[PDB]
């Protein structure tokens, strides 16, 4: 099982981008689902958090009304709109999945990891 992150490249602060997460296969369980960031030199952060249907988010203090997760059950997609981005912000990106919502925000909650994509915001 394959988490593949995109969306991922060069923008400009006060911008948006969206980013998607996609998988190698389907599972028959439902799963919540988180993205994750991690700056040159630090650990990766939680970002933001759904729950299997959809009807639970919650956020990271720092993208807070800022970032929007969805996601597409039918296409299998995990979205991250992206608005009012700032130089931080500039991290790798990953997306992974966990089998409850309450641990999939905590860094050692989740049973998959994506590669990561690279978001960079110049001023
Ligand atoms: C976490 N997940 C990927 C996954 C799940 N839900 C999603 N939901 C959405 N909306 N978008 C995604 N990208 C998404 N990705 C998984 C997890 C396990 C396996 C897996 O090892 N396959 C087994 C394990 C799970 C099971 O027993 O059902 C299987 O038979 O499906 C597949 C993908």
């Known amino acids: 099982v394959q988490l593949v992150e995109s969306g991922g490249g060069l923008v400009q602060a006060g911008g948006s981008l969206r980013l998607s997460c996609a998988a190698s296969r389907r599972s028959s369980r439902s799963w919540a689902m988180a993205w994750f960031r991690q700056a040159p030199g630090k650990e990766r952060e939680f970002v933001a958090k759904?729950?299997?249907?959809?009807?639970?988010?919650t956020y990271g203090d720092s993208v807070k009304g800022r970032f929007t997760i969805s996601r597409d059950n039918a296409e299998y997609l995990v979205y991250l709109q992206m608005d009012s981005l700032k130089p931080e912000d500039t991290a790798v990106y990953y997306c992974?999945?966990?089998?409850?919502?309450?641990?999939?925000?905590?860094?050692?909650?989740?049973?998959?990891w994506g590669q990561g994509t690279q978001v960079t915001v110049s001023s």
């Open positions: 992974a999945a966990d089998d409850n919502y309450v641990t999939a925000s905590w860094r050692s909650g989740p049973d998959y």
């Open positions: 759904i729950s299997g249907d959809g009807r639970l988010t």
